[PDB]
Structure 1
């Protein structure tokens, strides 16, 4: 590969490339959604604004009707026109194939009418405004002419090698350590939008540890990093590395990192025991030791520190029911529960005098999180809870997470920047996790609460700020009381870039895109990074 025509990117590939199935983004190579398959809309989180992508236009034309207008001249990478047929199919395939993640949309979407050649009217039986916003940016459009005779088992389990999407890149090749994306010269976006991605190839690289990426970035072997990297001041000073902010904290906030708790494991089943753990943990020690202040500690509700979310901040609820770092309070609660260290080994036993210990886990190689769960474990040990950190490889970590096979688990997959605070509370409480074996959408510890479901629906169905503020407070109160998830800090939108080959990266001063290619972020304008960068030579 001609080096000056190629973009080396990493930070999102933590298992060997083997799946490009748009229906299973948890297993698909990052960029499957974004580079290959495309959404109806982008959402710009910096300005809280939707940007029509495959759609030309979309709007609510009544309380329960949403009219979508598709652009003309859209085409699949194989030459076949992309039309409203494909959008209808993308939704209707999940009617019979209930195993598809968004099959439940048909509980509140009633039908999709064909208005004209490229216009659809979505008619809703139950207008869930908040979740619809997320569906508009996250649902990839798939080609009817390819998927329409696939069995449900194929739809859900097929690797989908050499995926046929509509996007600006297709898959050229792949191996244990990489997926090579090649530019689609016929991408509809070039003619219709005037957007021309500059890299001829994007090599998505896999490493076994963040530490490996350091030397690659130092030597200009990596162009675009979405790895957490330590020692950023030295990277910038000595290797000309660029970041979003010129100075500290260097990094945008991306999501809420916190601990999901297995509520079916004694004594993690005890709500007050989970509250004790919350009081025990010192997020500032993580902020300084793991991140050298590139992140900030989370408010107790875990609400991202962003105007779109914080206008609903339940200050009175947090003042009343919130937790903070206070080991005295944690120990008070533990003593009241009867968890006492009778045998004087520093570890509390349960009420029957039986010793117990727990694990906390993160992916191996995620170096900042390894340090973070060491810190968390040590805090818990300081109040007599025997907790040991464990570092499964990413694949085992993910299976532990999705299947709810853990004691404590550090995660941030579902608490990311979005068009609605509903996605946060859904990421925490996702009711369907309880009776499903695997959950990919949140509530990974399978916390059950019938009251919470009704409140999520209330929030979902509202478009009035006063009502939204009201429901957010009720949801936050239950979060703070039962703590199925303990919010600790806002993890960074890790971005550093080398200018050895590519320049004009987006920055605070020139915020033309959010330069993040993790799955979920291409549609949060990560894709627009590719149109702005310039080949130095």
Structure 2
């Protein structure tokens, strides 16, 4: 592999490459969706615009009808035409096979009509405009001719080695420590979009230690890093490394990191106690100690600071109902609630005099989160709440998170950048969590509020900015008053690059793509990174 034609990339491969199944992207090699399999649209979160990808055009032609026109001349990597039949298949297979992740689409999509050879009309029983935006960017189109013979379990359990997609790269080889993608010189995007991927190969590397990753970046052996790497601010200063911003906070935001609270456990069940905890926490201590100013603290509502979300920011609500670091306020609230240190041991007991302690947890070995929860636990101890950090192995953390068996838990899985603010509120408030044993979609502390469910549905079912702004204000007001989740900071969209070989990376001063190749991000313009870089 000629060095100046090969891009070495790390930050998303954490186990030996073994799965490339577009139906299970959470288990697939990162890039499966983006490099190999493609969506109808991209969403540009920097400019708050959709970009027709496989689709030439898509629009709502009535309240419950969405007309999609596919581009002409699309082909699968095996030379078979990609047509509207493959799109129909991609949706209808999930009607048949309910174990497919997006099978619930059929609860609100009624039918798909064939308008002409490349045009489909989606006829909705319940037009969920916000949720539809997420379908448009996150559902990969798959080839009927490859998947149509399979049973449900064959579909869901397939490793899908040598995946046949439509995208700009295919898998050439793999090993325990890498997946090698090779440029598809026939990619339809070259002729149809005028986009030409620059690397002939992309080598996706698994790197076992942060010392090796940072060392490789310094030596120009790793071109593109989506790893969290401590010390980047000093290394930039001393040695030179590309980041999105020249100064703090260095990185774009990826999601809202915060504390989910078990609202069904006394005294966490008292909304004012939750508010006291929020006043007690100093997010700037996390920004400095855990992240060396590579993140920013969140606004109290936790709304990501990107244009598609901020055009709905409820400033008057936040001004009135927000919180901030103020330990004296925290103590005042606790005193009013009757949580006083009667045993004289430095910890407040409950108003009946009964001692209690709480845990806060994050996964073992996730060092930045460990520092962060240690910092949180200290701040809470400082206002007399007995909190101890715990660091369960990942599988126990995940059982605690999804099962709801925690007191306080640090998480950011459902609050990522997306094509709609609805996904943030849904990830914080996910009403069905209250009724299921396990929730994977948010509201892990199982907060129940009928007004929230009504409002989230009104948000989903609106396509009107004025109404959306109103709904977002009411949702934010409830989040701030009841705090089942306490937003703390925006975790970074970690990006560093070496210019040893490749240059012209996207940055704040040349912001032509979001340079993140984690799963979910190719469709947020990560793919466009590959059209702009150039080899020295």
TM-score band, normalised by the shorter chain? Answer: over 0.9
Distance 1:227 1:87, change over 3 A: same
1:438 Cα deviation (Å)? 4.0
Secondary structure of the equivalent of 1:242? coil
Deviates further, 260-269 or 417-426: 260-269
**Counterpart residue number, 1:28:** 28
- Alignment check: 8 A CA contact 2:224 2:498 kept: yes
1:462 Cα deviation (Å)? 1.2
1:195 Cα deviation (Å)? 2.2
Distance 1:349 1:151, change over 3 A: farther
Distance 1:325 1:147, change over 3 A: same
Distance 1:244 1:127, change over 3 A: same
Distance 1:28 1:442, change over 3 A: farther
Distance 1:371 1:175, change over 3 A: farther
1:348 Cα deviation (Å)? 3.3
Secondary structure of the equivalent of 1:478? helix
- Alignment check: 8 A CA contact 2:45 2:307 kept: no
Distance 1:235 1:286, change over 3 A: same
1:534 Cα deviation (Å)? 1.4
1:395 Cα deviation (Å)? 5.5
Alpha-carbon displacement from aligned partner over 1:38-75 (angstroms, at most 9, x marks no partner): 11001111111111111111112222211111112222
Distance 1:449 1:191, change over 3 A: same
Alpha-carbon displacement from aligned partner over 1:103-145 (angstroms, at most 9, x marks no partner): 2222221111001111101111222112211211111112222
- Alignment check: 8 A CA contact 2:402 2:444 kept: yes
1:213 Cα deviation (Å)? 2.1
CA distance in structure 2 between the partners assigned to 1:186 and 1:395 by the alignment: 42
Secondary structure of the equivalent of 1:182? strand
- Alignment check: 8 A CA contact 1:33 1:522 kept: yes
Deviates further, 233-242 or 425-434: 233-242
1:371 Cα deviation (Å)? 2.0
Distance 1:467 1:257, change over 3 A: same
Distance 1:390 1:198, change over 3 A: farther
1:342 Cα deviation (Å)? 3.4
Alpha-carbon displacement from aligned partner over 1:331-382 (angstroms, at most 9, x marks no partner): 3333444444333333334455554433323344443323222211211221
Distance 1:341 1:181, change over 3 A: farther
- Alignment check: 8 A CA contact 1:225 1:497 kept: yes
- Alignment check: 8 A CA contact 2:89 2:144 kept: yes
Secondary structure of the equivalent of 1:56? strand
1:253 Cα deviation (Å)? 2.1
- Alignment check: 8 A CA contact 1:209 1:367 kept: no
Deviates further, 142-151 or 507-516: 142-151
Deviates further, 346-355 or 514-523: 346-355
Distance 1:80 1:326, change over 3 A: same
For structure 2, the 5+ residue unaligned runs are: none
Alpha-carbon displacement from aligned partner over 1:190-238 (angstroms, at most 9, x marks no partner): 3322322222322222334544422221122221111222322332234
Distance 1:329 1:176, change over 3 A: farther
Distance 1:46 1:158, change over 3 A: same
Distance 1:142 1:355, change over 3 A: farther
TM-score (norm 2): 0.93
Alpha-carbon displacement from aligned partner over 1:242-285 (angstroms, at most 9, x marks no partner): 11122333222222111122334444333333222212111111
1:88 Cα deviation (Å)? 1.0
**Counterpart residue number, 1:196:** 196
1:411 Cα deviation (Å)? 2.0
Distance 1:347 1:472, change over 3 A: same
CA distance in structure 2 between the partners assigned to 1:434 and 1:534 by the alignment: 50
Distance 1:112 1:477, change over 3 A: same
Q: How many residues align?
A: 535
Secondary structure of the equivalent of 1:520? coil
- Alignment check: 8 A CA contact 1:505 1:532 kept: yes
1:468 Cα deviation (Å)? 1.0
Distance 1:407 1:70, change over 3 A: same
CA distance in structure 2 between the partners assigned to 1:401 and 1:219 by the alignment: 39
- Alignment check: 8 A CA contact 2:249 2:296 kept: no
Alpha-carbon displacement from aligned partner over 1:442-467 (angstroms, at most 9, x marks no partner): 22333222221111110111122221
- Alignment check: 8 A CA contact 1:455 1:471 kept: yes
- Alignment check: 8 A CA contact 1:220 1:498 kept: yes
CA distance in structure 2 between the partners assigned to 1:484 and 1:176 by the alignment: 41
For structure 1, the 5+ residue unaligned runs are: none
**Counterpart residue number, 1:426:** 426
Distance 1:424 1:345, change over 3 A: same
- Alignment check: 8 A CA contact 1:210 1:367 kept: no
CA distance in structure 2 between the partners assigned to 1:356 and 1:149 by the alignment: 58
- Alignment check: 8 A CA contact 1:41 1:136 kept: yes
Deviates further, 462-471 or 435-444: 435-444
Distance 1:499 1:135, change over 3 A: same
- Output aligned runs, 1:5-154, within 5 Å: 5-154=5-154
- Alignment check: 8 A CA contact 1:210 1:365 kept: no
Deviates further, 100-109 or 218-227: 100-109
Secondary structure of the equivalent of 2:202? strand
TM-score (norm 1): 0.92
- Alignment check: 8 A CA contact 2:74 2:82 kept: yes
Secondary structure of the equivalent of 2:296? coil
CA distance in structure 2 between the partners assigned to 1:427 and 1:375 by the alignment: 25
1:514 Cα deviation (Å)? 0.7
CA distance in structure 1 between the partners assigned to 2:242 and 2:3 by the alignment: 20
Distance 1:98 1:482, change over 3 A: farther
Secondary structure of the equivalent of 1:468? helix
Deviates further, 116-125 or 206-215: 206-215
Q: What is the RMSD computed on CA atoms of the aligned residues? A: 2.4
Deviates further, 396-405 or 226-235: 396-405
Secondary structure of the equivalent of 1:88? helix
